Amino acid sequence: MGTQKVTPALIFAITVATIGSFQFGYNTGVINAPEKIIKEFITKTLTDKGNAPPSEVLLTSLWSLSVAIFSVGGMIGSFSVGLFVNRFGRRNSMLIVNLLAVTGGCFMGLCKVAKSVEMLILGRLVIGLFCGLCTGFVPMYIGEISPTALRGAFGTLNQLGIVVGILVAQIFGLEFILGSEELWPLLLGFTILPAILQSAALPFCPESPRFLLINRKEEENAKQILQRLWGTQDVSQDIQEMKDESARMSQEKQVTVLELFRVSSYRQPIIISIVLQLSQQLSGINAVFYYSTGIFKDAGVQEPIYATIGAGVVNTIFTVVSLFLVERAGRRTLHMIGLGGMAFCSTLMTVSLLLKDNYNGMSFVCIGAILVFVAFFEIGPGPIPWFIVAELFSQGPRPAAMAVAGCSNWTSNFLVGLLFPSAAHYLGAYVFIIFTGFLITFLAFTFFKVPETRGRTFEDITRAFEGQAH
Ligand SMILES: CCCCCCCC/C=C/CCCCCCCC(=O)OC[C@H](O)CO
Ligand SMILES: CCCCCCCC/C=C\CCCCCCCC(=O)OC[C@H](O)CO
Ligand SMILES: CCCCCCCC/C=C\CCCCCCCC(=O)OC[C@H](O)CO
Numbered sequence: 001m002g003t004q005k006v007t008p009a010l011i012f013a014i015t016v017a018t019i020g021s022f023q024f025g026y027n028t029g030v031i032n033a034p035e036k037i038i039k040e041f042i043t044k045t046l047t048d049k050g051n052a053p054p055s056e057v058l059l060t061s062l063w064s065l066s067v068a069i070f071s072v073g074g075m076i077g078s079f080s081v082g083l084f085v086n087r088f089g090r091r092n093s094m095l096i097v098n099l100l101a102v103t104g105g106c107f108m109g110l111c112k113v114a115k116s117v118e119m120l121i122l123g124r125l126v127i128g129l130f131c132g133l134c135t136g137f138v139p140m141y142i143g144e145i146s147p148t149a150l151r152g153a154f155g156t157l158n159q160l161g162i163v164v165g166i167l168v169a170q171i172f173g174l175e176f177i178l179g180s181e182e183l184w185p186l187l188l189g190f191t192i193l194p195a196i197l198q199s200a201a202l203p204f205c206p207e208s209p210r211f212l213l214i215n216r217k218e219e220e221n222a223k224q225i226l227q228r229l230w231g232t233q234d235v236s237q238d239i240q241e242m243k244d245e246s247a248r249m250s251q252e253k254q255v256t257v258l259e260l261f262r263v264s265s266y267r268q269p270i271i272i273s274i275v276l277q278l279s280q281q282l283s284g285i286n287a288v289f290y291y292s293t294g295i296f297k298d299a300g301v302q303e304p305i306y307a308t309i310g311a312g313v314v315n316t317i318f319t320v321v322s323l324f325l326v327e328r329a330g331r332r333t334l335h336m337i338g339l340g341g342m343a344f345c346s347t348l349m350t351v352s353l354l355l356k357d358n359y360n361g362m363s364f365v366c367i368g369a370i371l372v373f374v375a376f377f378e379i380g381p382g383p384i385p386w387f388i389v390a391e392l393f394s395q396g397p398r399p400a401a402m403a404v405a406g407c408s409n410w411t412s413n414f415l416v417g418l419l420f421p422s423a424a425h426y427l428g429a430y431v432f433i434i435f436t437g438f439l440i441t442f443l444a445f446t447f448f449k450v451p452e453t454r455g456r457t458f459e460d461i462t463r464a465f466e467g468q469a470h
Protein backbone atom coordinates (compact mmCIF):
# COMPACT_ATOMS: atom_id res chain seq x y z
CA MET A 1 0.00 0.00 0.00
CA GLY A 2 2.83 2.39 0.72
CA THR A 3 1.30 5.43 2.31
CA GLN A 4 -2.15 4.54 0.93
CA LYS A 5 -4.85 4.04 3.53
CA VAL A 6 -8.40 2.81 3.84
CA THR A 7 -10.19 6.05 4.71
CA PRO A 8 -13.76 6.62 5.86
CA ALA A 9 -14.23 8.49 2.57
CA LEU A 10 -13.18 5.41 0.61
CA ILE A 11 -15.39 3.07 2.68
CA PHE A 12 -18.29 5.49 2.19
CA ALA A 13 -17.91 5.63 -1.60
CA ILE A 14 -17.59 1.87 -1.94
CA THR A 15 -20.49 1.07 0.41
CA VAL A 16 -22.79 3.56 -1.34
CA ALA A 17 -21.90 1.99 -4.69
CA THR A 18 -22.72 -1.48 -3.36
CA ILE A 19 -26.28 -0.41 -2.59
CA GLY A 20 -26.76 -1.16 -6.29
CA SER A 21 -25.26 -4.61 -5.67
CA PHE A 22 -27.75 -5.06 -2.84
CA GLN A 23 -30.52 -4.10 -5.28
CA PHE A 24 -29.46 -6.76 -7.75
CA GLY A 25 -29.42 -9.43 -5.02
CA TYR A 26 -32.70 -8.30 -3.49
CA ASN A 27 -34.57 -8.25 -6.80
CA THR A 28 -33.05 -11.58 -7.81
CA GLY A 29 -34.17 -13.31 -4.63
CA VAL A 30 -37.33 -11.53 -3.56
CA ILE A 31 -39.72 -12.98 -6.14
CA ASN A 32 -39.22 -16.59 -5.07
CA ALA A 33 -40.78 -16.84 -1.58
CA PRO A 34 -44.13 -15.24 -2.61
CA GLU A 35 -44.56 -17.45 -5.71
CA LYS A 36 -47.86 -18.99 -4.59
CA ILE A 37 -49.29 -15.64 -3.47
CA ILE A 38 -48.32 -14.01 -6.76
CA LYS A 39 -49.95 -16.86 -8.69
CA GLU A 40 -53.14 -16.25 -6.70
CA PHE A 41 -52.89 -12.57 -7.59
CA ILE A 42 -52.65 -13.49 -11.28
CA THR A 43 -55.66 -15.81 -11.00
CA LYS A 44 -57.84 -13.34 -9.11
CA THR A 45 -56.88 -10.46 -11.37
CA LEU A 46 -57.85 -12.40 -14.48
CA THR A 47 -61.22 -13.42 -13.01
CA ASP A 48 -61.90 -10.04 -11.38
CA LYS A 49 -61.70 -8.60 -14.88
CA GLY A 50 -64.15 -11.26 -16.00
CA ASN A 51 -61.88 -13.78 -17.74
CA ALA A 52 -61.97 -17.50 -17.18
CA PRO A 53 -59.57 -18.61 -14.45
CA PRO A 54 -56.19 -19.56 -15.88
CA SER A 55 -55.11 -23.18 -16.15
CA GLU A 56 -52.00 -24.41 -14.35
CA VAL A 57 -50.23 -24.13 -17.73
CA LEU A 58 -51.12 -20.44 -18.18
CA LEU A 59 -50.35 -19.64 -14.54
CA THR A 60 -46.96 -21.28 -14.86
CA SER A 61 -46.32 -19.44 -18.09
CA LEU A 62 -47.33 -15.99 -16.56
CA TRP A 63 -45.34 -16.74 -13.41
CA SER A 64 -42.32 -17.65 -15.55
CA LEU A 65 -42.74 -14.42 -17.53
CA SER A 66 -42.86 -12.43 -14.27
CA VAL A 67 -39.61 -14.00 -13.16
CA ALA A 68 -37.77 -14.15 -16.48
CA ILE A 69 -38.55 -10.65 -17.80
CA PHE A 70 -36.25 -9.43 -15.06
CA SER A 71 -33.42 -11.31 -16.82
CA VAL A 72 -34.45 -9.83 -20.18
CA GLY A 73 -34.27 -6.34 -18.64
CA GLY A 74 -30.90 -7.29 -17.18
CA MET A 75 -29.59 -8.43 -20.58
CA ILE A 76 -30.53 -5.07 -22.10
CA GLY A 77 -29.34 -2.99 -19.16
CA SER A 78 -25.98 -4.72 -18.80
CA PHE A 79 -25.32 -4.37 -22.54
CA SER A 80 -26.08 -0.63 -22.28
CA VAL A 81 -23.50 0.01 -19.54
CA GLY A 82 -20.81 1.32 -21.89
CA LEU A 83 -23.11 4.00 -23.28
CA PHE A 84 -23.90 5.41 -19.84
CA VAL A 85 -20.52 5.41 -18.12
CA ASN A 86 -18.62 7.07 -20.97
CA ARG A 87 -21.29 9.70 -21.60
CA PHE A 88 -22.19 10.64 -18.02
CA GLY A 89 -19.38 9.23 -15.92
CA ARG A 90 -19.52 6.31 -13.49
CA ARG A 91 -20.88 8.08 -10.40
CA ASN A 92 -23.33 10.15 -12.44
CA SER A 93 -24.64 7.05 -14.23
CA MET A 94 -25.36 5.35 -10.90
CA LEU A 95 -27.29 8.42 -9.77
CA ILE A 96 -29.36 8.81 -12.94
CA VAL A 97 -30.48 5.19 -13.22
CA ASN A 98 -32.12 5.27 -9.79
CA LEU A 99 -34.99 6.85 -11.71
CA LEU A 100 -35.48 3.37 -13.19
CA ALA A 101 -35.30 1.72 -9.77
CA VAL A 102 -37.97 3.94 -8.24
CA THR A 103 -40.18 3.68 -11.32
CA GLY A 104 -39.95 -0.12 -11.49
CA GLY A 105 -40.42 -0.36 -7.74
CA CYS A 106 -43.58 1.74 -7.89
CA PHE A 107 -45.00 -0.35 -10.75
CA MET A 108 -44.52 -3.49 -8.66
CA GLY A 109 -45.79 -1.85 -5.48
CA LEU A 110 -48.96 -0.62 -7.21
CA CYS A 111 -49.79 -3.64 -9.39
CA LYS A 112 -52.18 -5.19 -6.87
CA VAL A 113 -54.30 -2.08 -6.24
CA ALA A 114 -54.27 -1.43 -10.00
CA LYS A 115 -55.34 -5.07 -10.54
CA SER A 116 -52.78 -5.25 -13.31
CA VAL A 117 -50.64 -8.26 -14.17
CA GLU A 118 -49.18 -6.06 -16.92
CA MET A 119 -47.83 -3.65 -14.30
CA LEU A 120 -46.12 -6.46 -12.37
CA ILE A 121 -44.45 -7.59 -15.61
CA LEU A 122 -43.45 -4.05 -16.65
CA GLY A 123 -42.15 -3.44 -13.14
CA ARG A 124 -39.93 -6.52 -13.28
CA LEU A 125 -38.70 -5.48 -16.73
CA VAL A 126 -37.78 -1.97 -15.57
CA ILE A 127 -36.10 -3.11 -12.35
CA GLY A 128 -34.27 -5.65 -14.55
CA LEU A 129 -32.97 -2.80 -16.74
CA PHE A 130 -31.80 -1.06 -13.57
CA CYS A 131 -30.15 -4.16 -12.09
CA GLY A 132 -28.39 -4.99 -15.37
CA LEU A 133 -26.93 -1.48 -15.39
CA CYS A 134 -25.89 -1.92 -11.73
CA THR A 135 -24.06 -5.17 -12.37
CA GLY A 136 -21.74 -3.30 -14.73
CA PHE A 137 -21.59 0.08 -12.99
CA VAL A 138 -20.66 -1.09 -9.52
CA PRO A 139 -17.60 -3.32 -10.14
CA MET A 140 -16.39 -0.75 -12.68
CA TYR A 141 -16.64 2.08 -10.16
CA ILE A 142 -15.09 0.06 -7.34
CA GLY A 143 -12.32 -1.16 -9.64
CA GLU A 144 -11.52 2.40 -10.68
CA ILE A 145 -11.42 3.98 -7.19
CA SER A 146 -9.73 1.19 -5.18
CA PRO A 147 -6.03 1.06 -4.26
CA THR A 148 -4.46 -1.57 -6.50
CA ALA A 149 -3.40 -3.74 -3.54
CA LEU A 150 -7.01 -4.04 -2.36
CA ARG A 151 -8.84 -3.95 -5.70
CA GLY A 152 -9.93 -7.59 -5.44
CA ALA A 153 -11.03 -7.35 -1.81
CA PHE A 154 -13.05 -4.24 -2.54
CA GLY A 155 -14.34 -5.81 -5.76
CA THR A 156 -15.64 -8.67 -3.61
CA LEU A 157 -17.81 -6.17 -1.69
CA ASN A 158 -19.97 -6.02 -4.82
CA GLN A 159 -20.78 -9.70 -4.37
CA LEU A 160 -21.15 -9.20 -0.62
CA GLY A 161 -23.86 -6.62 -1.34
CA ILE A 162 -25.51 -9.07 -3.74
CA VAL A 163 -25.64 -11.96 -1.26
CA VAL A 164 -26.80 -9.69 1.56
CA GLY A 165 -29.53 -8.53 -0.82
CA ILE A 166 -30.59 -12.14 -1.46
CA LEU A 167 -30.62 -12.97 2.25
CA VAL A 168 -32.63 -9.89 3.20
CA ALA A 169 -35.10 -10.76 0.43
CA GLN A 170 -35.44 -14.30 1.85
CA ILE A 171 -35.94 -13.05 5.39
CA PHE A 172 -38.48 -10.40 4.35
CA GLY A 173 -40.21 -13.06 2.23
CA LEU A 174 -41.30 -14.86 5.39
CA GLU A 175 -45.07 -14.86 5.92
CA PHE A 176 -44.98 -12.94 9.20
CA ILE A 177 -42.79 -10.25 7.67
CA LEU A 178 -43.81 -9.04 4.19
CA GLY A 179 -44.60 -12.34 2.49
CA SER A 180 -48.33 -12.39 3.21
CA GLU A 181 -51.27 -12.30 0.80
CA GLU A 182 -51.78 -8.75 2.00
CA LEU A 183 -48.41 -7.10 1.84
CA TRP A 184 -46.46 -8.86 -0.91
CA PRO A 185 -46.55 -5.74 -3.13
CA LEU A 186 -44.52 -3.98 -0.41
CA LEU A 187 -42.02 -6.84 -0.55
CA LEU A 188 -41.48 -5.88 -4.20
CA GLY A 189 -41.82 -2.12 -3.71
CA PHE A 190 -39.10 -2.21 -1.05
CA THR A 191 -36.50 -1.72 -3.81
CA ILE A 192 -37.44 1.99 -3.93
CA LEU A 193 -35.97 2.49 -0.43
CA PRO A 194 -32.30 1.59 -1.14
CA ALA A 195 -32.69 3.64 -4.35
CA ILE A 196 -33.68 6.73 -2.37
CA LEU A 197 -30.83 6.16 0.12
CA GLN A 198 -28.24 5.62 -2.60
CA SER A 199 -29.45 8.62 -4.59
CA ALA A 200 -29.13 10.90 -1.55
CA ALA A 201 -25.58 9.67 -0.86
CA LEU A 202 -24.16 9.50 -4.39
CA PRO A 203 -23.57 13.26 -4.91
CA PHE A 204 -21.09 13.11 -2.03
CA CYS A 205 -19.23 10.22 -3.66
CA PRO A 206 -16.40 11.14 -6.00
CA GLU A 207 -16.54 10.58 -9.73
CA SER A 208 -14.04 7.93 -10.80
CA PRO A 209 -10.61 9.64 -10.80
CA ARG A 210 -9.65 7.40 -13.71
CA PHE A 211 -12.62 8.70 -15.68
CA LEU A 212 -11.67 12.26 -14.72
CA LEU A 213 -7.98 12.01 -15.65
CA ILE A 214 -8.11 9.62 -18.58
CA ASN A 215 -11.48 10.30 -20.22
CA ARG A 216 -11.73 13.97 -19.37
CA LYS A 217 -8.07 14.95 -19.05
CA GLU A 218 -8.62 16.50 -15.59
CA GLU A 219 -5.36 15.46 -13.97
CA GLU A 220 -5.53 17.97 -11.12
CA ASN A 221 -9.05 17.02 -10.04
CA ALA A 222 -8.25 13.31 -10.26
CA LYS A 223 -5.14 13.76 -8.12
CA GLN A 224 -7.06 15.56 -5.38
CA ILE A 225 -9.74 12.82 -5.36
CA LEU A 226 -7.07 10.13 -4.91
CA GLN A 227 -5.30 12.07 -2.20
CA ARG A 228 -8.50 12.33 -0.16
CA LEU A 229 -9.79 8.78 -0.87
CA TRP A 230 -6.49 7.12 -0.08
CA GLY A 231 -5.47 9.44 2.77
CA THR A 232 -2.08 10.45 1.38
CA GLN A 233 -0.48 13.30 -0.51
CA ASP A 234 1.80 10.93 -2.40
CA VAL A 235 -0.06 9.34 -5.33
CA SER A 236 2.46 9.88 -8.15
CA GLN A 237 2.76 6.19 -8.96
CA ASP A 238 -0.94 5.92 -9.63
CA ILE A 239 -1.25 9.22 -11.47
CA GLN A 240 1.62 8.26 -13.79
CA GLU A 241 -0.04 4.87 -14.39
CA MET A 242 -3.22 6.74 -15.35
CA LYS A 243 -1.26 9.10 -17.61
CA ASP A 244 0.19 6.01 -19.33
CA GLU A 245 -3.38 4.77 -19.83
CA SER A 246 -4.39 8.20 -21.10
CA ALA A 247 -1.61 8.04 -23.70
CA ARG A 248 -2.83 4.55 -24.62
CA MET A 249 -6.46 5.58 -24.98
CA SER A 250 -5.47 8.55 -27.15
CA GLN A 251 -3.43 6.20 -29.36
CA GLU A 252 -6.08 3.48 -29.76
CA LYS A 253 -9.16 3.79 -31.95
CA GLN A 254 -12.49 4.35 -30.18
CA VAL A 255 -13.52 0.94 -28.86
CA THR A 256 -16.66 -0.82 -30.12
CA VAL A 257 -18.19 -4.08 -28.95
CA LEU A 258 -17.37 -5.82 -32.24
CA GLU A 259 -13.75 -4.64 -32.12
CA LEU A 260 -13.23 -6.59 -28.90
CA PHE A 261 -13.42 -9.81 -30.92
CA ARG A 262 -11.37 -8.59 -33.90
CA VAL A 263 -8.20 -7.48 -32.07
CA SER A 264 -5.93 -10.15 -30.55
CA SER A 265 -5.02 -7.98 -27.55
CA TYR A 266 -8.75 -7.47 -26.88
CA ARG A 267 -9.96 -10.92 -27.89
CA GLN A 268 -7.91 -12.78 -25.29
CA PRO A 269 -9.28 -10.83 -22.32
CA ILE A 270 -12.85 -10.70 -23.69
CA ILE A 271 -12.96 -14.48 -24.21
CA ILE A 272 -11.55 -14.95 -20.71
CA SER A 273 -14.15 -12.48 -19.42
CA ILE A 274 -17.08 -14.17 -21.15
CA VAL A 275 -15.97 -17.70 -20.21
CA LEU A 276 -15.66 -16.64 -16.58
CA GLN A 277 -19.26 -15.37 -16.65
CA LEU A 278 -20.34 -18.66 -18.18
CA SER A 279 -18.47 -20.54 -15.44
CA GLN A 280 -20.52 -18.60 -12.90
CA GLN A 281 -23.95 -19.19 -14.46
CA LEU A 282 -23.44 -22.62 -16.07
CA SER A 283 -22.37 -23.82 -12.63
CA GLY A 284 -26.13 -24.03 -12.22
CA ILE A 285 -26.07 -21.77 -9.15
CA ASN A 286 -29.44 -20.08 -9.78
CA ALA A 287 -31.11 -23.34 -10.78
CA VAL A 288 -29.74 -24.98 -7.61
CA PHE A 289 -30.84 -22.01 -5.53
CA TYR A 290 -34.29 -21.64 -7.03
CA TYR A 291 -35.11 -25.35 -7.05
CA SER A 292 -33.42 -25.96 -3.66
CA THR A 293 -36.70 -25.61 -1.80
CA GLY A 294 -38.19 -28.47 -3.80
CA ILE A 295 -35.06 -30.61 -3.64
CA PHE A 296 -34.80 -30.09 0.14
CA LYS A 297 -38.49 -31.05 0.38
CA ASP A 298 -38.00 -34.18 -1.70
CA ALA A 299 -35.04 -35.22 0.46
CA GLY A 300 -37.31 -34.90 3.49
CA VAL A 301 -36.67 -31.47 4.99
CA GLN A 302 -39.97 -30.87 6.80
CA GLU A 303 -39.67 -27.08 6.74
CA PRO A 304 -37.69 -26.44 3.52
CA ILE A 305 -37.83 -22.64 3.73
CA TYR A 306 -35.46 -22.78 6.71
CA ALA A 307 -32.97 -24.88 4.76
CA THR A 308 -33.11 -22.38 1.88
CA ILE A 309 -32.55 -19.47 4.27
CA GLY A 310 -29.72 -21.55 5.70
CA ALA A 311 -28.29 -21.65 2.17
CA GLY A 312 -28.64 -17.86 2.02
CA VAL A 313 -26.64 -17.61 5.24
CA VAL A 314 -23.90 -19.96 3.95
CA ASN A 315 -24.00 -17.82 0.77
CA THR A 316 -23.13 -14.76 2.85
CA ILE A 317 -20.56 -16.35 5.15
CA PHE A 318 -18.39 -17.68 2.36
CA THR A 319 -18.48 -14.43 0.42
CA VAL A 320 -16.82 -12.91 3.50
CA VAL A 321 -14.31 -15.78 3.48
CA SER A 322 -13.50 -14.94 -0.16
CA LEU A 323 -13.11 -11.26 0.74
CA PHE A 324 -10.35 -12.09 3.21
CA LEU A 325 -8.56 -14.55 0.91
CA VAL A 326 -8.68 -13.02 -2.57
CA GLU A 327 -5.60 -10.79 -2.18
CA ARG A 328 -3.65 -13.62 -0.57
CA ALA A 329 -4.66 -16.68 -2.59
CA GLY A 330 -5.28 -14.70 -5.76
CA ARG A 331 -8.15 -14.82 -8.24
CA ARG A 332 -6.94 -17.95 -10.08
CA THR A 333 -6.71 -20.09 -6.98
CA LEU A 334 -10.07 -19.12 -5.48
CA HIS A 335 -11.91 -19.44 -8.79
CA MET A 336 -10.46 -22.91 -9.37
CA ILE A 337 -11.16 -24.10 -5.82
CA GLY A 338 -14.76 -22.95 -6.18
CA LEU A 339 -15.25 -24.61 -9.57
CA GLY A 340 -13.67 -27.87 -8.44
CA GLY A 341 -15.60 -27.94 -5.16
CA MET A 342 -18.85 -27.23 -6.98
CA ALA A 343 -18.07 -30.05 -9.43
CA PHE A 344 -17.70 -32.42 -6.47
CA CYS A 345 -20.96 -31.28 -4.90
CA SER A 346 -23.04 -31.28 -8.08
CA THR A 347 -21.83 -34.82 -8.76
CA LEU A 348 -22.76 -35.72 -5.18
CA MET A 349 -26.25 -34.23 -5.75
CA THR A 350 -26.75 -36.60 -8.68
CA VAL A 351 -25.40 -39.61 -6.76
CA SER A 352 -27.39 -38.94 -3.59
CA LEU A 353 -30.61 -38.34 -5.50
CA LEU A 354 -30.14 -41.57 -7.45
CA LEU A 355 -29.55 -43.55 -4.26
CA LYS A 356 -31.82 -41.93 -1.65
CA ASP A 357 -34.97 -43.97 -2.36
CA ASN A 358 -32.99 -47.15 -1.75
CA TYR A 359 -30.65 -45.85 0.94
CA ASN A 360 -32.38 -43.15 2.97
CA GLY A 361 -29.14 -41.93 4.57
CA MET A 362 -28.26 -40.45 1.18
CA SER A 363 -31.13 -37.99 1.66
CA PHE A 364 -28.98 -36.14 4.17
CA VAL A 365 -25.98 -36.26 1.86
CA CYS A 366 -28.13 -34.48 -0.74
CA ILE A 367 -29.11 -31.74 1.73
CA GLY A 368 -25.46 -31.25 2.71
CA ALA A 369 -24.25 -31.27 -0.90
CA ILE A 370 -26.46 -28.28 -1.77
CA LEU A 371 -25.18 -26.26 1.18
CA VAL A 372 -21.54 -27.05 0.42
CA PHE A 373 -22.15 -26.29 -3.28
CA VAL A 374 -23.18 -22.76 -2.32
CA ALA A 375 -20.11 -22.42 -0.06
CA PHE A 376 -17.74 -23.31 -2.89
CA PHE A 377 -19.62 -21.02 -5.26
CA GLU A 378 -18.89 -18.00 -3.10
CA ILE A 379 -15.22 -18.85 -2.52
CA GLY A 380 -14.53 -17.63 -6.05
CA PRO A 381 -17.06 -18.13 -8.87
CA GLY A 382 -19.56 -15.78 -7.20
CA PRO A 383 -17.42 -12.70 -6.58
CA ILE A 384 -14.56 -12.91 -9.06
CA PRO A 385 -16.26 -12.92 -12.49
CA TRP A 386 -18.06 -9.65 -11.76
CA PHE A 387 -14.97 -7.61 -10.86
CA ILE A 388 -12.22 -9.40 -12.79
CA VAL A 389 -13.48 -8.01 -16.11
CA ALA A 390 -12.59 -4.51 -14.87
CA GLU A 391 -9.08 -5.79 -14.10
CA LEU A 392 -8.50 -7.42 -17.50
CA PHE A 393 -8.91 -4.18 -19.48
CA SER A 394 -7.41 -0.71 -19.64
CA GLN A 395 -9.57 2.41 -19.45
CA GLY A 396 -10.55 2.57 -23.11
CA PRO A 397 -12.04 -0.87 -23.75
CA ARG A 398 -13.27 -1.49 -20.18
CA PRO A 399 -16.85 -0.15 -20.57
CA ALA A 400 -17.53 -2.08 -23.81
CA ALA A 401 -15.96 -5.19 -22.29
CA MET A 402 -18.05 -5.02 -19.12
CA ALA A 403 -21.14 -4.48 -21.29
CA VAL A 404 -20.37 -7.62 -23.31
CA ALA A 405 -19.33 -9.73 -20.33
CA GLY A 406 -22.25 -8.58 -18.19
CA CYS A 407 -24.66 -9.28 -21.02
CA SER A 408 -23.18 -12.78 -21.46
CA ASN A 409 -23.73 -13.33 -17.73
CA TRP A 410 -27.41 -12.34 -17.82
CA THR A 411 -27.97 -14.16 -21.12
CA SER A 412 -26.47 -17.42 -19.89
CA ASN A 413 -28.64 -17.13 -16.75
CA PHE A 414 -31.64 -16.71 -19.04
CA LEU A 415 -30.69 -19.82 -21.02
CA VAL A 416 -30.23 -21.91 -17.86
CA GLY A 417 -33.70 -20.89 -16.67
CA LEU A 418 -35.20 -21.62 -20.08
CA LEU A 419 -33.61 -25.03 -20.62
CA PHE A 420 -33.17 -26.51 -17.13
CA PRO A 421 -36.82 -27.61 -16.64
CA SER A 422 -36.79 -29.60 -19.89
CA ALA A 423 -33.35 -31.01 -19.17
CA ALA A 424 -34.48 -32.06 -15.70
CA HIS A 425 -37.60 -33.67 -17.18
CA TYR A 426 -35.58 -35.98 -19.43
CA LEU A 427 -32.47 -36.55 -17.30
CA GLY A 428 -33.85 -36.48 -13.76
CA ALA A 429 -31.02 -36.58 -11.20
CA TYR A 430 -28.47 -36.75 -14.05
CA VAL A 431 -29.28 -33.16 -15.01
CA PHE A 432 -26.72 -31.95 -12.49
CA ILE A 433 -23.98 -33.77 -14.44
CA ILE A 434 -24.52 -31.12 -17.15
CA PHE A 435 -23.36 -28.50 -14.65
CA THR A 436 -20.54 -30.83 -13.56
CA GLY A 437 -19.38 -30.99 -17.18
CA PHE A 438 -19.34 -27.21 -17.54
CA LEU A 439 -17.61 -26.78 -14.18
CA ILE A 440 -14.82 -29.18 -15.15
CA THR A 441 -14.45 -27.64 -18.62
CA PHE A 442 -14.12 -24.18 -17.10
CA LEU A 443 -11.80 -25.43 -14.34
CA ALA A 444 -9.44 -26.56 -17.10
CA PHE A 445 -9.90 -23.25 -18.95
CA THR A 446 -9.16 -21.27 -15.81
CA PHE A 447 -5.98 -23.19 -15.02
CA PHE A 448 -4.56 -22.81 -18.52
CA LYS A 449 -5.83 -19.42 -19.65
CA VAL A 450 -6.79 -17.05 -16.83
CA PRO A 451 -4.03 -14.68 -15.74
CA GLU A 452 -3.46 -13.73 -12.12
CA THR A 453 -4.56 -10.12 -11.67
CA ARG A 454 -3.78 -9.59 -7.98
CA GLY A 455 -1.56 -6.59 -7.21
CA ARG A 456 -1.14 -5.68 -10.88
CA THR A 457 -1.98 -2.36 -12.53
CA PHE A 458 -4.40 -2.29 -15.45
CA GLU A 459 -1.50 -1.19 -17.65
CA ASP A 460 0.65 -4.15 -16.41
CA ILE A 461 -2.09 -6.57 -17.37
CA THR A 462 -2.74 -4.92 -20.73
CA ARG A 463 0.96 -4.96 -21.67
CA ALA A 464 1.06 -8.66 -20.80
CA PHE A 465 -1.80 -9.42 -23.20
CA GLU A 466 -0.09 -7.42 -25.92
CA GLY A 467 3.13 -9.33 -25.27
CA GLN A 468 1.31 -12.65 -25.54
CA ALA A 469 -0.40 -11.45 -28.72
CA HIS A 470 2.95 -10.46 -30.24
C1 LIG B 1 -32.61 9.80 2.23
C2 LIG B 1 -33.25 8.78 3.13
C3 LIG B 1 -33.41 7.44 2.45
C4 LIG B 1 -34.56 6.53 2.89
C5 LIG B 1 -34.06 5.53 3.92
C6 LIG B 1 -34.08 4.10 3.43
C7 LIG B 1 -33.27 3.19 4.32
C8 LIG B 1 -34.03 1.91 4.61
C9 LIG B 1 -33.68 0.92 3.55
C10 LIG B 1 -32.42 0.61 3.48
C11 LIG B 1 -31.97 -0.34 2.45
C12 LIG B 1 -30.82 -1.06 3.02
C13 LIG B 1 -29.70 -0.77 2.09
C14 LIG B 1 -28.77 -1.93 2.24
C15 LIG B 1 -27.53 -1.73 1.41
C16 LIG B 1 -26.41 -2.58 1.91
C17 LIG B 1 -25.21 -2.42 1.00
C18 LIG B 1 -24.39 -3.62 1.27
O1 LIG B 1 -24.89 -4.71 1.26
O2 LIG B 1 -22.99 -3.55 1.62
C19 LIG B 1 -22.20 -4.71 1.44
C20 LIG B 1 -20.85 -4.32 1.87
O3 LIG B 1 -21.06 -3.83 3.19
C21 LIG B 1 -20.39 -3.16 1.01
O4 LIG B 1 -19.65 -2.37 1.93
C1 LIG C 1 -44.80 -20.46 0.43
C2 LIG C 1 -44.08 -21.66 1.03
C3 LIG C 1 -42.55 -21.57 0.99
C4 LIG C 1 -41.93 -22.19 -0.27
C5 LIG C 1 -40.75 -21.41 -0.86
C6 LIG C 1 -39.60 -21.13 0.10
C7 LIG C 1 -38.27 -20.68 -0.52
C8 LIG C 1 -38.06 -19.17 -0.36
C9 LIG C 1 -36.64 -18.75 -0.05
C10 LIG C 1 -35.65 -18.89 -0.90
C11 LIG C 1 -35.81 -19.47 -2.28
C12 LIG C 1 -34.53 -19.15 -3.05
C13 LIG C 1 -34.58 -17.73 -3.51
C14 LIG C 1 -33.35 -16.94 -3.15
C15 LIG C 1 -32.29 -17.26 -4.17
C16 LIG C 1 -32.76 -16.89 -5.54
C17 LIG C 1 -32.06 -17.75 -6.49
C18 LIG C 1 -32.50 -17.43 -7.84
O1 LIG C 1 -31.72 -17.58 -8.69
O2 LIG C 1 -33.83 -16.94 -8.14
C19 LIG C 1 -34.16 -16.76 -9.51
C20 LIG C 1 -35.48 -17.36 -9.70
O3 LIG C 1 -35.71 -17.43 -11.05
C21 LIG C 1 -36.42 -16.42 -9.07
O4 LIG C 1 -36.40 -15.31 -9.87
C1 LIG D 1 -42.10 -22.09 -18.79
C2 LIG D 1 -40.92 -23.03 -18.83
C3 LIG D 1 -39.66 -22.31 -19.32
C4 LIG D 1 -38.66 -22.13 -18.18
C5 LIG D 1 -38.95 -20.86 -17.40
C6 LIG D 1 -39.16 -19.68 -18.34
C7 LIG D 1 -37.84 -19.15 -18.86
C8 LIG D 1 -37.04 -18.47 -17.76
C9 LIG D 1 -35.82 -17.80 -18.35
C10 LIG D 1 -34.91 -17.24 -17.56
C11 LIG D 1 -35.09 -17.25 -16.06
C12 LIG D 1 -33.86 -16.65 -15.39
C13 LIG D 1 -34.18 -16.17 -13.98
C14 LIG D 1 -34.04 -14.66 -13.87
C15 LIG D 1 -33.64 -14.25 -12.46
C16 LIG D 1 -32.15 -14.46 -12.23
C17 LIG D 1 -31.43 -13.12 -12.04
C18 LIG D 1 -30.01 -13.37 -11.60
O1 LIG D 1 -29.75 -13.56 -10.42
O2 LIG D 1 -28.93 -13.39 -12.58
C19 LIG D 1 -28.79 -12.32 -13.50
C20 LIG D 1 -27.52 -12.51 -14.32
O3 LIG D 1 -27.33 -13.91 -14.58
C21 LIG D 1 -26.33 -11.98 -13.53
O4 LIG D 1 -25.88 -12.97 -12.60
Ligand SMILES: OC[C@H]1O[C@H](O)[C@H](O)[C@@H](O)[C@@H]1O
Nearest residue numbers: 028159162163285286315382
Ligand atom coordinates in the same frame (compact mmCIF):
# COMPACT_ATOMS: atom_id res chain seq x y z
O1 LIG E 1 -25.22 -15.45 -4.80
C1 LIG E 1 -25.89 -15.78 -5.99
C2 LIG E 1 -25.68 -14.73 -7.07
O2 LIG E 1 -24.30 -14.72 -7.34
C3 LIG E 1 -23.84 -13.94 -8.42
O3 LIG E 1 -23.96 -12.59 -8.13
C4 LIG E 1 -24.65 -14.17 -9.69
O4 LIG E 1 -24.32 -13.24 -10.72
C5 LIG E 1 -26.14 -14.17 -9.44
O5 LIG E 1 -26.80 -14.63 -10.61
C6 LIG E 1 -26.43 -15.13 -8.31
O6 LIG E 1 -27.79 -15.12 -8.04
